[model samples]
Target: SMSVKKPKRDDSKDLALCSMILTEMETHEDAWPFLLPVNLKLVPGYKKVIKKPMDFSTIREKLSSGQYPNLETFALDVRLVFDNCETFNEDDSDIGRAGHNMRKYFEKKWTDTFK
Candidate 1:
């Protein structure tokens, strides 16, 4: 059980930003900060998409196929992203609002990805 901070440092938003930037490149934003092309069409005949956890690599592959060239092609209906996740429990749903998973989800991503 250890609870301590750096030997000494400023305690402000600026410091927080520095810490995050040095650690996690993505700031307080969604994981896929990559801008989707505007009005990007999903295949007209396609119906099934992701319902389980997203791997993102799938989208990355599509993004590299020139299907999504810029902010002039893609459209998404996302309600949750890496940065916007809380948890997958009915009880966690009532613990807090969107920001409820702020610590667990965000920090865990940082740890796993970096470690």
Candidate 2:
């Protein structure tokens, strides 16, 4: 969970998609970046398991509702990269857990932020 970060928005184009998602809320895990848990490398069992998604729906909803300053767009570029989390392979390539962590961690943050 420590690896999770929410950096202030900047103008650098080199910013990773993860950074952007944290800054805002729009995330298409399928396309942004890493789609599986970070420990997937260590926890091989998580390699293909379709666990919960890192819920960024609040961000999506916020954007959709015109909640944030217009970054100019209402939605982020998180696309459907993987058809499903079942076919993933250990030896094969993989996705990051941004969506998963985003769902869990971000939700916790949301609760804490409001509480």
Candidate 3:
């Protein structure tokens, strides 16, 4: 007789940390405000493309929609905010240091999830 084995279940504990980290970043929106880019695609003479920062509110919206199926992708989005941030310098700034800690915190949780 053949037997069926159930797949392993995923716990929200690890995800909770990831979500917390991302949410905390959103909570600090005052320190790292999102940049609004002027739409220049319609301008024929526009020479440079402006880089815009992703808003945490928008990220929240995306997340609420169940868009990200994998944690890696979700982490990638968080990295995008960190990468695009112009308000904080990780080595010399307080907020930057806080951001570093946030990343570290989530990284630990992310690793633990797989284990």
Candidate 4:
């Protein structure tokens, strides 16, 4: 009897890279607002405006649990954090400005590290 097997690719490298990037993002000065999930009580209508909230702590948990299959998937979640911030905050607002700054930093790191 013959058995077919799907090809398996090692993701350890990508995982390590993601972990490193996450650490940098977590420590960034602008990381304060994104460190944890938004407090619904503090900000009303946030849940309605941001369908899917993404944060550093959540991303760290997911990454450690092997939820991200590829670098792109991890990148998507990272970008989502900023995207949600932009949607919920005004450009001049503290959180909104932090979001833009963080996005810029992430993109630069991503290109330098992966591209």
Q: What is the TM-score of each candidate against the true structure?
A: 0.24, 0.26, 0.51, 0.88
2 versus 4: better lDDT goes to: 4
lDDT measured at residue 34 in model 1 versus the true structure, 0 to 100: 20
Top TM-score prediction, candidate number? 4
Q: Kindly report which residue stretches of model 4 are placed more than 4 angstroms away from their true locations once superposed.
A: 1-11
Task: Estimate the lDDT of model 4.
Answer: 0.93
Worst 10 residues of 1 by lDDT: 70-79
Q: Candidate 4 lDDT, tens digit per residue, 34-77?
A: 99989977989998789999999999999999898899999999
The CA lDDT of each predicted structure is 0.35, 0.41, 0.56, 0.93
Per-residue lDDT of candidate 2, residues 6-84 (tens digit): 8866634323333444554433444344433245567565445745322245444454554645332222222222223
Candidate 3 collision pairs:
none
Model 1 lDDT at residue 113: 37
- With candidate 1 superimposed using the best TM-score fit, by how many Å does residue 35's alpha carbon deviate from the native? 17
Tens-digit per-residue lDDT, 36-105, candidate 1:
3212255332123323332234334444464544322221212233322333333344323434444455
Best by lDDT: 4
RMSD of each: 14.9, 14.2, 6.6, 3.6
Q: After superposition, how far is residue 8 of candidate 2 from its true place, in Å?
A: 30
Model 4 per-residue lDDT at 61: 99
Q: Is 1 or 2 the stronger prediction by lDDT?
A: 2
